[PDB]
Amino acid sequence: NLYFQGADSCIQFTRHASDVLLNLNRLRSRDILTDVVIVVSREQFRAHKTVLMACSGLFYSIFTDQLKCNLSVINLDPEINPEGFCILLDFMYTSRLNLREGNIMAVMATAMYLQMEHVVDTCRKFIKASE
Amino acid sequence: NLYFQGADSCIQFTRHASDVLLNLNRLRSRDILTDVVIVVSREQFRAHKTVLMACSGLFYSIFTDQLKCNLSVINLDPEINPEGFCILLDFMYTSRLNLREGNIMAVMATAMYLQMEHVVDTCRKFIKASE
Ligand SMILES: Cn1c(=O)n(CCC(C)(C)O)c2cc(Nc3ccnc(Cl)c3C#N)ccc21
Numbered sequence: 001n002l003y004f005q006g007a008d009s010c011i012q013f014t015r016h017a018s019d020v021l022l023n024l025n026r027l028r029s030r031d032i033l034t035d036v037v038i039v040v041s042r043e044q045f046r047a048h049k050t051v052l053m054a055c056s057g058l059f060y061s062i063f064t065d066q067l068k069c070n071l072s073v074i075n076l077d078p079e080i081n082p083e084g085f086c087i088l089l090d091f092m093y094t095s096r097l098n099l100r101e102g103n104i105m106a107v108m109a110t111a112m113y114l115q116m117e118h119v120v121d122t123c124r125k126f127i128k129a130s131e
Numbered sequence: 132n133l134y135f136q137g138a139d140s141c142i143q144f145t146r147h148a149s150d151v152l153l154n155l156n157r158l159r160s161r162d163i164l165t166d167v168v169i170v171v172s173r174e175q176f177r178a179h180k181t182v183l184m185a186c187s188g189l190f191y192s193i194f195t196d197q198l199k200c201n202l203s204v205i206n207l208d209p210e211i212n213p214e215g216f217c218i219l220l221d222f223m224y225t226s227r228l229n230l231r232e233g234n235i236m237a238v239m240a241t242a243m244y245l246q247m248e249h250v251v252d253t254c255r256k257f258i259k260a261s262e
């Protein structure tokens with residue numbers, strides 16, 4: 001059964017939020033309604049501003065700025081590792097974080113810069129486990 | 132714990148999709164980055180095209196149309212009940228469907244028109260339970 005009686009007596013759909021996220025990632029894959037390019041060193045990443053703002057304190061701050069909300073192109077700090085950014089952008093659209101020994105330092109540094117609290121906390125816990 | 136080992140060995144965040152959806156509904160409440168007005172009889176509803184497309188076959192068809200993707204205003208069939216539309220728009224952004232005896236017929240008719248398969252199926256099952 002795809003639904004249940006919510007605590008607030010509303011009927012709630014168990015998979016709805018994940019199904020919505022899957023469809024926003026399908027739109028991204030197909031470059032449909034993307035409205036920003038994120039530039040990380042040479043690399044460019046197309047995305048939807050609303051997804052970026054929902055997942056990151058930095059993007060939230062940028063796209064609620066009266067001057068910056070109208071930018072089609074956002075350049076990140078050139079010290080940001082593009083692979084670390086790619087792993088975090090994928091996480092934003094999937095809930096899945098591809099954390100590995102070889103990328104955890106870049107992923108954590110990028111997540112700190114993007115203000116992605118849950119990811120930063122998770123990276124710290126995985127680093128602490130070694131240690 | 133907010134994460135787990137996914138089936139594909141990625142670390143997966145249990146609440147991420149629901150947290151993203153909550154933030155998109157906060158953006159909607161605050162009228163931030165909304166890019167379309169849906170007109171239903173007299174009533175106007177501001178939304179994000181990407182959320183509408185993710186939840187509805189009709190909005191998906193409209194906003195992937197090369198001519199219609201560029202419309203800031205979408206008028207629905209004037210036979211559509213605004214309360215039924217409001218309940219479905221709220222559902223899109225929350226996973227919560229406020230189905231009641233007094234609104235189920237309007238909700239189902241609107242969901243059929245919007246091509247929201249899971250909601251239609253759910254309405255049919257609740258109607259069948261009476262009957
Ligand atoms: C520090 N930080 C986060 O870690 N995250 C990620 C939250 C989580 C749980 C998704 O992972 C954030 C999302 C936002 N975005 C919003 C916050 C409040 N209100 C609105 Cl409208 C928005 C939007 N859009 C802001 C800051 C953040």
Ligand SMILES: Cn1c(=O)n(CCC(C)(C)O)c2cc(Nc3ccnc(Cl)c3C#N)ccc21
Pocket residue numbers: 016019020023024026027030181184185186187188189191246247248249
């Ligand atoms: C009939 N129908 C639905 O019931 N729904 C709602 C699915 C559910 C599970 C959310 O409830 C639909 C979403 C879409 N949207 C997409 C489908 C495929 N690919 C992409 Cl990119 C999109 C987008 N955006 C299309 C048709 C639909």
